[PDB]
């Protein structure tokens, strides 16, 4: 008869490297209202939020993790955003028998069950680009791939995963080059080794430097296909950078025809999910709550993952249903919510939500090609069901994709 409060300890990065908390906290607030107003999910329980601003800093977050664990009320789950913050709270969590659910972590390292035994994330691992890559390689008949990365743990980890995935498909990595800040020598080597199919992993500043060097070495054209992460700003190659010699027209030339993969964060379909909202309705509902415009407010594109994280937990708690008796010294309830979280399968605002053995979210990827200085949607890929939606929107200079080999030139 008496509805009992059950608490989530969350960390929202309002500033730092990824200020995802700016749009993710209201998305969380909306999802809790939606779960609590529905009498068919947790009728006996009321889901409440206790949060702090982590500032996307592990040191800063260590202070708030203390504040969440050593102050009443007892929290039943921990919800961090940033990969660096999730690495800290997911490793520490076993000492308080706590499930950790991240709404914003993409680091491949976070999909390690030995280090992170109770960790889940609605945000997929950066390794989700790799099955789409191996599938596009298989489609266009390429078995020889060159890789170029900026020196970052996340990129190294992503390329490490790509290796074991190409080996399964009968595809090999010809050459692997890396750079900390200057990509002049790794790109010069790509031309020297006569690389044709190239996967490049870097941030936007470095991408402009890579493609300026790519123009100078004429590392673009009919012969070459570049595979990049589709996470850059709208006309990134056109953005002014005084550190690069190349012109706007020169890099619009160098980037022509390249392929990008991007994790789908909002269902492109017009269907209704468990909240009974459409992807478009969620956006409109979210836009209303915000003080500032979506363009200004950080983590806006990731906000559907935070909304869906709340539903994943609500439904997991619904499957278990003795929540008031949770204690940090007891594994019993934790093991039950872990089992319910591991068995998650529902439709959310970001699409179908399921977790792999590592606790990492499985999702669709959006495949695009740059055609005439603009990205054009060429398809979507579903890693789990192995199904590729082909648009028939792709274009190539020789009327068909080139080849990896010296053979057809």
């Amino acid at each position: 008869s008496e509805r009992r409060a059950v608490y989530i300890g969350a960390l929202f990065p309002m500033s730092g490297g990824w200020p995802g908390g700016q749009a993710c906290q209201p998305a969380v607030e909306m999802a809790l209202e939606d779960v609590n107003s529905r009498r068919d999910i947790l009728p006996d329980y009321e889901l409440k939020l206790i949060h702090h601003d982590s500032k996307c800093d592990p040191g800063q977050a260590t202070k708030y993790l203390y504040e969440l664990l050593y102050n009443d009320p007892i929290k039943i789950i921990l919800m961090p955003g940033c990969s660096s913050v999730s690495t800290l709270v997911a490793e520490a969590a076993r000492m308080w028998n706590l499930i950790v659910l991240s709404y914003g972590s993409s680091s491949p390292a976070l999909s390690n069950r030995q280090r992170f035994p109770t960790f889940f994330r609605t945000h997929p691992s950066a390794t989700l680009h790799n099955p789409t890559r191996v599938k596009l390689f298989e489609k266009w008949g390429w078995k020889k791939i060159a890789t170029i990365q900026q020196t970052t743990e996340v990129f190294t980890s992503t390329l490490d995963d790509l290796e074991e995935r190409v080996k399964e498909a009968g595809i090999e990595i010809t050459f692997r080059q890396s750079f900390f800040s200057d990509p002049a020598v790794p790109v010069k080597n790509l031309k020297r080794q006569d690389a044709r199919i190239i996967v490049g992993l870097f941030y936007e500043t470095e991408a402009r430097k890579v493609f300026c060097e790519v123009y100078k070495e004429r590392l673009f054209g009919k012969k070459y296909v570049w595979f990049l992460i589709g996470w850059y700003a709208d006309n990134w190659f056109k953005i002014y950078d005084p550190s690069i010699n190349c012109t706007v027209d020169e890099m619009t030339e160098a980037v022509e025809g390249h392929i990008t993969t991007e994790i789908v964060m909002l269902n492109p379909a017009n269907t209704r999910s468990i909240s009974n909202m459409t992807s478009q309705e969620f956006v409109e509902k979210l836009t209303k709550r915000l003080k500032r415009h979506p363009e200004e407010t950080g983590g806006f594109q990731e906000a559907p993952l935070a909304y869906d994280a709340i539903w994943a937990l609500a439904l997991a708690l619904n499957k278990t249903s003795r929540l008031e008796d949770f204690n940090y010294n007891n594994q019993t309830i934790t093991d039950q919510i872990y089992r319910a979280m591991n068995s998650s399968s529902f439709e959310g605002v970001s699409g179908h939500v399921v977790f792999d053995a590592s606790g990492s979210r499985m999702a669709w990827t959006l495949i695009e090609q740059l055609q005439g200085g603009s990205y054009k949607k060429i398809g979507y890929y579903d890693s789990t069901k192995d199904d590729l939606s082909w648009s028939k929107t792709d274009k190539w200079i020789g009327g068909s994709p080139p080849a990896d080999d010296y053979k057809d030139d």
């Binding site: 040191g59 203390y66 520490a92 000492m95």
Partner: protein, 403 residues
Amino acid sequence: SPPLSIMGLMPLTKEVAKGSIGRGVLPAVELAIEQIRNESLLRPYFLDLRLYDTECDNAKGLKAFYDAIKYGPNHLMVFGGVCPSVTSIIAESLQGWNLVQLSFAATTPVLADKKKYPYFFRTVPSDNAVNPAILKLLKHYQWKRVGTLTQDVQRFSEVRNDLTGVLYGEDIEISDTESFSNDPCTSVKKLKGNDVRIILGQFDQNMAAKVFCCAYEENMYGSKYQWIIPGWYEPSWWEQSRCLRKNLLAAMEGYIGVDFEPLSSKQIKTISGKTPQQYEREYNNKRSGVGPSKFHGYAYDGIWVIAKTLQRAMETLHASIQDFNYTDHTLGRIILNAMNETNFFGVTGQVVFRNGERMGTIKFTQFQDSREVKVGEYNAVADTLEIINDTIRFQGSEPPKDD
């Protein structure tokens, strides 16, 4: 007699491998505490050191720290932090509780970043502290061209990365940079081919025996070669596939080892009124059955750094402690300023910091027939090198040439 509480964070369990560092330094800690209490240096107060076992684990170590803040007394500062990943977790968060930390055994260079670890200090020189010492050695023997051999493990690549910056703007060329993960033989053959004579090696004890095995096979030893490698290996480390033992010893002959100096060689009285030799006898009697630790002097000098810092802080307050709780930003800044003033002669030599980093002494050794023998010492404060006369030796008439 009010307490000045200090949070002692270290692995103390016999079960944990690094618990030997924690337990091995405790007799030295006890000695410094006992004397400071007797002399009533902190009068009216007394140093209250509370020990919490971190177990050398990220989760357990964080919980130990968290439990010390929750259930423990109001600590004024942290003492300890041995294991690199646990220490980095605590050291990064320090400002959140306005706690200054002093470590005596965490040597990882990462901690020198004062943007990330502003409240962290250490009495022990870091793994990078060997590089200004090696520069001095190269200058002394007129070695202007060097090759490098590094194991692809973070502990070693950190040192190799720091070397680049130390040799920049000096008349020293790194003619060949070679890395290896499991087998050094390919890299050792490239060094031989590039005609490298002076090799700066950064690799573990297990890899060292492989390095010297490849060195014997490629004849990269004798009168023409100088290997400058880590000096922190276990004694008789080489005794512990294809080369013979006699052939390993032949290639090893004359290598120079570089590591921090455990205790001062100067027979001068320290802040306690004892010379380093007298303290060492006092430590060896007190330790009893507990095995010795090379960080014992750094732990001892550590207690003196804390007591002297607390003195300065007490004077600063009087110039204008009980109410301090982690909330007092101002006291934390006072303690932080007082620690930066540290300048006294301790059992590990002169104890002085340069941006939280110890300016200490680096020991140079040379492998001669059956063991490593001390051949010199580098003073980081003065930036000087002293080579012990009639110890260091070369197989040829002169020290080797770099080309």
